[PDB]
Structures are given as structure tokens and as C-alpha cells.
A paper describes a structure:
The lipase from [name] is a family I.1 lipase (100% identical to Proteus sp. k107 lipase) that has potential for practical applications (hereafter referred to as PML). Here we present crystal structures of PML in the absence and presence of diethyl phosphonate, a potent lipase inhibitor. Like the other family I.1 and I.2 lipases, PML adopts an α/β hydrolase fold with a central β-sheet core of 5 parallel β-strands and the first two βstrands are missing compared to the canonical α/β hydrolase fold. PML contains a typical hydrolase Ser-His-Asp catalytic triad with the catalytic serine, S79, part of a G-X-S-X-G motif between α3 and β5.
The placement of the lid helices α5 and α8 suggest that PML is in a “closed” conformation with the position of α5 preventing access of long-chain triacylglycerols to the active site. The position of α5 is similar to that seen in the closed conformation of BGL and in stark contrast to the position of the lid seen in the open conformation of PAL that has an inhibitor bound. Surprisingly, in both the DEP inhibited and apo structures of PML, the positively charged loop between α5 and α6 adopts a conformation that opens an ∼9Å diameter hole in PML. The hole allows 2 PEG molecules from the crystallization solvent to be accommodated in a wide pocket that extends to S79 and exposes the active site of PML to solvent, even in the “closed” conformation. S79 appears to be in a “catalytically competent” conformation in PML even in the absence of inhibitor with the Oγ of S79 pointed away from the Nε2 of H254. The observed differences in the PML oxyanion hole suggests that the oxyanion hole is unique in PML and much more open than in other I.1 and I.2 lipases of known structure. It is also possible that the oxyanion hole is not pre-formed in the closed structure of PML. We also see remarkable differences in the active site pocket as it is much more exposed and solvent accessible than the active site seen in other lipases of known structure, even though our PML structure otherwise appears to be in a closed conformation. The Ca2+ ion in PML is found octahedrally coordinated to five main-chain or side-chain atoms and a single water. In PML, the Ca2+ is coordinated by atoms from the side chains of N210, D213, D256, the main-chain carbonyl oxygens from Q260 and L264, and a water molecule.
Residue numbers in the entry: 2 to 146, 149 to 287
């Protein structure tokens, strides 16, 4: 139904193999039921945004050859949107749209803290343990069974590193903190979705059986930005035209994880399928 194929983009190349199901849980399946052509680009987590960007460009080149489409519609999460922005900035004629879903568009405060912990920069022990136990719980839930090894993925998501990325690829970033960027830059459409953790944990419905959610709530308390999804602050997610960012969902919830266990009986998959129809309505 969309003119151009949809490319789902995320970091963690080994996710599907190690976890046993897709990063975007049930989302590609749902989009294909609505007649969209869908592909997933799983990029290398333990490296720079620019390296993921180059990875994604190679993926897109091969895909465009195989489809004879002239452009792609990117839908990225977390690391994904930065790689998408790299490709859009550098190869705008090959990108119809960039949609950012809880993208780390201006850095992650927990990544910042993680680096301070790793550098032993005067972080009190009780905070060190809370942060490391949270990440361990998240990793173990997905993998099945160390938490300091996660810095490999967060290294490229610090405020300092993303600020440097934004300096090189400023397209569609908001001019004011917590605002919106230009919808169309260099012929490419930019959209953003977001969320932040809300309410007391008792009312989270499906998430009560998801061990990652309590961990995200722990990480959430260490942000100076009070509205955050446990990994990124609400304002940091902003890119291009806002669609909606007040979902009561953590970072992991917004890709329908773990295995469909989300907050408040929200239909996360519907966020994606409705947006795909929205892209189609914009002649994309
Ligand atoms: Ca970078
Ligand atoms: Ca969840």
C-alpha cells in the first residue's frame, strides 16, 4: 500500500538469533497483512552511529536493486533512527521518509551515567548496583541468562557522542528543546514517535509479567529529564514532525517487547500499521 518499501531499523544484529524472535515483535508480520512490502535491517550495536549508517546504506543499495524501488521508508527504534538519519543526510534521493520511534536523537542520560560508572567517576556504590542489576535483568530476560558488557552498545548513545553526530547530521532536529523539527528536509519526510513511563507500576497490566519493565523504572529514576522511557528522555527523542509521544510505555514496550507484554493494554502494533497507512496517504 505504501509506494516505497518499509525498512524496519534497529541495533543488535544478533538479536533474532540469540533471543529467538524479532526485535520489532510481530510488527513486520502485521505490516505485511496490510499489503506493505517490509524488510528489516539489523545493525551492529557495538560501534558508532556512522558505522551503522554505512551498514544501512549498503543494505539499502542492495535492497533498491532487488526491488527496483527508488526510495525506502525507514522506521527506526533506539539506535536505528541515527543510522537512518545518516543515510537520509547523505543519500536523500534514496530515502522517502525517516520515522523515529523512541530514537536517541539527542543522547541518553543512562548511557552518560553508565560511562561514569565504567570510568569510576565518583558514583556511589548503591547507584552502581541499582543500574547494573537493572541492565542485567533486562539482558537476562532476553538472552535467557555480564551487565557491564552492555556499555558496548551505550558508548555511541551518550549525550557527548550524539551531540557530535547531530553536528554532522543536523537535518530535521528541533530548533528548540522539546519542540519539533522541519517535516521535510532535502525532500525527505521526517516523523517522530515517543513515550515515557507513567503511573504507578501496579496498574501496568501486561507489563506485570515482563521483568524488563521494573528494571526500566529503576533506570528511569536516574534521569534529570523526568519524562523518559528508561533509556532516553522524552525531549531527546524528537525529530521532524511529531505524531504522538505521550504513550505510557517504556523503551522496550515501544517495539512490543517482551513478546507482546506491554503497558496498559496498549496496541503497540497498531501504532506501526496506522503510521504505514499515514505514509501511504502522503504518497510515500
Ligand atoms: Ca557516533
Ligand atoms: Ca514490556
Amino acid at each position: 500500500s505504501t509506494k516505497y518499501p518499509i525498512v524496519l531499523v534497529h541495533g543488535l544484529a544478533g538479536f533474532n538469533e540469540i533471543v529467538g524472535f524479532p526485535y520489532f515483535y510481530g510488527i513486520a508480520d502485521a505490516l505485511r497483512q496490510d499489503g506493505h512490502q517490509v524488510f528489516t535491517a539489523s545493525l551492529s550495536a557495538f560501534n558508532s552511529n556512522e558505522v551503522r549508517g554505512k551498514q544501512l546504506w549498503q543494505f539499502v543499495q542492495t535492497l533498491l536493486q532487488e526491488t527496483q524501488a527508488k526510495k525506502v521508508n525507514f522506521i527506526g527504534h533506539s539506535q536505528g533512527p541515527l543510522a537512518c538519519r545518516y543515510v537520509a543526510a547523505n543519500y536523500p534521493d534514496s530515502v522517502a521518509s525517516v520515522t523515529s520511534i523512541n530514537g536517541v536523537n539527542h543522547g541518553s542520560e543512562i548511557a552518560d551515567l553508565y560511562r561514569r560508572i565504567m570510568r569510576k567517576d565518583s558514583i556511589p556504590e548503591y547507584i552502581v548496583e541499582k543500574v547494573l542489576n537493572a541492565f542485567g535483568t533486562i539482558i537476562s530476560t532476553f538472552s535467557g541468562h555480564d551487565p557491564q558488557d552492555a556499555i558496548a552498545a551505550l558508548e555511541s548513545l551518550t549525550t557527548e557522542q550524539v551531540t557530535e553526530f547531530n553536528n554532522k547530521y543536523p537535518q530535521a532536529l528541533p530548533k528548540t528543546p522539546g519542540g519539533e523539527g522541519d517535516e521535510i528536509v532535502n525532500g525527505v519526510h521526517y516523523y517522530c514517535f515517543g513515550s515515557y513511563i507513567q503511573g504507578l507500576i501496579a496498574g501496568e497490566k501486561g507489563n506485570l509479567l515482563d521483568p524488563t519493565h521494573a528494571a526500566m523504572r529503576v533506570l528511569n529514576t536516574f534521569f534529570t529529564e523526568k519524562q523518559n522511557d528508561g533509556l532516553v528522555g522524552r525531549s531527546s527523542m524528537r525529530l521532524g514532525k511529531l505524531i504522538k509521544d505521550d504513550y505510557a510505555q517504556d523503551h522496550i514496550d515501544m517495539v512490543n517487547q517482551v513478546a507482546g507484554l506491554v503497558g496498559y493494554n496498549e496496541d503497540i502494533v497498531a501504532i506501526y500499521t496506522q503510521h504505514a497507512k499515514y505514509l501511504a496517504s502522503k504518497q510515500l
